[PDB]
Structure formats: C-alpha cells, structure tokens
Structure 1
Amino acid sequence: HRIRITLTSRNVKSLEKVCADLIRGAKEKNLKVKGPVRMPTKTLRITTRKTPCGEGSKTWDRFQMRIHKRLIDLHSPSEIVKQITSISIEPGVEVEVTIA
C-alpha cells in the first residue's frame, strides 16, 4: 500500500515532466502522496588528457555526467500503480517501483 517510485534520469526537464505526471496521476485518482524528494544529484567525472600522444601542452578535458534521482511515496493499491506507471514515460527516465 506504501509504494515507493524511484525516478532516476540523466536529463532534468524529462525527469521533472515524469514526476509532474505522477503527481497529476496521484491527485486526479485522489490517493495520498508524499511529495517528490529531490535526492542529491551525482556528477560522474572523468578527466583525460586531450592529446592521444604525449606531445602538446598538458590540456585536460573534464567529462561530467549528472544523474538526478527523485523518489515519490504513494498510499495506493498495487494494480492502481501498475496502471499509472505504465502510462506516458519518456526514454531518458528509469522508473523502479518498490511494492513494499
């Protein structure tokens, strides 16, 4: 009954659109919803030399890859969540539904 949706995405606006649709999907069906908890975004970092050889001035590229995690708690029966979460997802976002 306490069902915990984990929205993890690389993009923010796709993740904010999905978590906004899951608040509208929880408000229209009138089930009690703990708000989307913004988790601390993880910046995956790789700093390589630019040069494929060793013969320039030592320039470095610094590749970030931000991963944003939200999570939403619902007071909802199982099959109601199975219907909600299966509708209108966009491929940037990864959705993991925890039953209990």
Structure 2
Amino acid sequence: QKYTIIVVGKDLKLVERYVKSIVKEGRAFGISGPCRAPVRRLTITTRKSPCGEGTNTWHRFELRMYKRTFWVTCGGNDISTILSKTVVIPGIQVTVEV
C-alpha cells in the first residue's frame, strides 16, 4: 500500500536535514522523490508605531511555510518503522496518509 507523506517546516534549514534523512531511512521502501510545494508566504504588514503618530512606517512580518512531497509503498508496520527511523528535529509537521 502507498502512503502519502507531507512535511511542513517554517525554517528551511530545519526541513533541509529532514528531507536528507527521509531518503536515508526509506530507500528500501522506495520513498518518492522530494518535490517541494511552492512556499506559502504568510505576510502581515502592521504599522510599526503603537500609536499612529509620526511618519506612517510599516513593519512587514513574513512566515514562509515550506512543504515536501513523499510517497512510500510499504507495509502498515513499515511506515511506522520509517516514522521512528527519520531524524527527529523539534517543531516539525509529520503526515501519515493513504
């Protein structure tokens, strides 16, 4: 059975290692090539000032969300083996699907 895997990482460097680990754990289970979802840019522009006094300077805050595409043809136990096998780094999105 083939299971869909999606990983969302805010920091590109933190997901960069995770994608390298994903190939080095599921190679026998034939993990899919890591297509990268186009960045989802969460953008908030807020006036920098607590008040509205002074020039209207704007504070731009952006969270870039990166996502990767993975599929593994393996047993029900085998995805769980890769889920334990992949490098665990904190604050990551883990997806198990059918």
TM-score, normalised by the number of residues in structure 2: 0.91
Q: Which secondary structure does the structure 1 equivalent of 2:32 belong to?
A: strand
Ranges of 4+ aligned residues in structure 1 off by more than 3 Å: none
Pairing 1:86–2:84 present: yes
Percent of aligned pairs with the same amino acid: 32
Q: What is the RMSD computed on CA atoms of the aligned residues? A: 1.1
Alpha-carbon offset, residue 42 of structure 1: 0.6
Alpha-carbon offset, residue 55 of structure 1: 1.0
How many pairs align?
A: 97
Matches within 5 A, 1:8-27: 8-27=8-27
1:14 touches 1:92 (CA, 8 Å); kept in 2?
A: no
Matches within 5 A, 1:1-100: 1-27=1-27, 30-87=28-85, 88-98=87-97, 100=98
* Structure whose residues are more often strand by fraction: 1
Gaps of 5+ in 2: none
Alpha-carbon offset, residue 7 of structure 1: 0.4
Q: Which secondary structure does the structure 2 equivalent of 1:53 belong to?
A: coil
Q: Which secondary structure does the structure 1 equivalent of 2:7 belong to?
A: strand
